[PDB]
Paper text:
Due to the fact that seladelpar is a relatively low-affinity PPARα/γ ligand, its cocrystals were obtained by cocrystallization with a delipidized PPARα-LBD or with PPARγ-LBD and SRC1. X-ray diffraction has revealed the monomeric structures for PPARα and PPARγ, as well as the dimeric structure for PPARδ. The electron density maps located a single seladelpar molecule per PPARα/δ/γ-LBD protein monomer. The obtained PPARα/δ/γ-LBD helical structures were identical to those of previously reported active conformations described for lanifibranor above. Seladelpar was found to be located in the similar position of the “Center” and the “Arm II” regions in PPARα/δ/γ-LBD; however, its orientations differed. Likewise, the orientations of the carboxylic group of seladelpar toward the four consensus amino acids in PPARα/δ/γ-LBD were different from those of lanifibranor. The PPARδ-selective agonist seladelpar activated PPARδ with the highest potency (EC50: 20.2 nM) and efficacy (99.3%) compared to PPARα (1.64 µM and 41.0%) and PPARγ (3.53 µM and 58.5%). Some other consensus amino acids, such as Ile272/Cys276/Phe318/Leu321 in PPARα-LBD, Val245/Cys249/Phe291/Leu294 in PPARδ-LBD, and Ile281/Cys285/Tyr327/Leu330 in PPARγ-LBD, were stabilized by all three ligands, whereas some consensus amino acids (i.e., Leu247/Ala250/Val255/Ala333 in PPARα-LBD and Leu255/Glu259/Phe264/Ser342 in PPARγ-LBD) were specifically stabilized by seladelpar and other consensus amino acids (i.e., Leu347/Phe351, Leu320/Phe324 and Leu356/Phe360 in PPARα/δ/γ-LBD, respectively) were stabilized only by lanifibranor. Seladelpar could activate all PPAR subtypes; however, the EC50 values for PPARδ-LBD were ~2 orders lower than those for PPARα/γ-LBD, and this is why seladelpar can be used as a PPARδ-selective agonist in clinical use.
Residue numbers in the entry: 200 to 231, 237 to 260, 265 to 468
Write the structure that this text describes.
Amino acid sequence: TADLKSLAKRIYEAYLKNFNMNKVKARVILSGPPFVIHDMETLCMAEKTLVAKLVANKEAEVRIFHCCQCTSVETVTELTEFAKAIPGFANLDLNDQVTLLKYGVYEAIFAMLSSVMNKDGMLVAYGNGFITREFLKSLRKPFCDIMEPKFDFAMKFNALELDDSDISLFVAAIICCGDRPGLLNVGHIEKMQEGIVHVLRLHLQSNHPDDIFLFPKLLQKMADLRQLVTEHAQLVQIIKKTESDAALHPLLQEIYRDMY
Ligand SMILES: CCO[C@H](COc1ccc(C(F)(F)F)cc1)CSc1ccc(OCC(=O)O)c(C)c1
């Protein structure tokens, strides 16, 4: 359908406009310049070059965690502007918009994070760094436990070989969940959701004719992400309570407040 075909395009264009990183841009960088962070020496070098103000000191693990949070805060802003392209989102009650973004952002973050991840590491700092998976595993607990579950999800997610046209709709569908707690107008949100999911189903059928189960596979990935986010918040809570030097950005505190 032209109406749905153009809706898919609208979403895709809002995704390209509002997110600094996309899969094509990430694969260009990852093909072959990003500074490689593989040990403590290269981490400290990268900090002096890419986040100089940060180290003009606390444990490396705490500094890394603060850099992680800065990326989240930035992606929240990107996701908030992206949400406007979703038919009906800007028409929802202002409180429902906040609730949908509150519960959706981290699911969206980890879904999109897969695009800059491969089995050896991930792009960081607006594509200018590459931190290795093994270095992250080498951090002292509990900080070494943060990223490995995200790599596990990303390797299987990337095996699906989605492109940005698919991912834009997937992220839209994540935001349009009518079963988020505290929604005022569930019925309108469900209809909004049904509309995005309908476009996603048709788009996957056209864009991925070789994989007839791709749509149900992504439905399951949405459930997987919800559990990934729940477990992530639990680890974040442990760090907040037991790491006196690891403070949470207030915007991210509110997102976690009364989540899981
Ligand atoms: C390490 C994984 O983090 C990536 C960026 O981390 C950086 C590490 C080092 C540097 C620097 F280049 F400055 F050294 C930059 C980013 C961003 S992805 C991310 C996003 C959110 C995360 O959880 C924090 C949160 O709940 O908001 C975590 C643990 C990771």
